Amino acid sequence: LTESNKKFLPFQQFGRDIADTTDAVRDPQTLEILDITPCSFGGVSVITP
């Protein structure tokens, strides 16, 4: 969760991606916008003789 610069309109609560997954949220206690980025992942290759 990171601080974001998305200009949320006051009636808007969530942000959505192309695949309709949530990309940004509004914190309920403090009205601020948080970007959601998935944690670091990748492939692992083994190079051996």
Place this chain on the structure above:
Amino acid sequence: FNFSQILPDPSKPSKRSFIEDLLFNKVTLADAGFIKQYGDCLGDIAARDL
């Protein structure tokens, strides 16, 4: 015969000719970098393109 338009150009950082530069500029790649490396995608800015 004049082959300066197809022989490599040493002034360019990559040794490509004039015609090869035109062929590379005319084809619009979506993303030819392949060097995103997950560090570019940490920041969610609208300049990030797909």
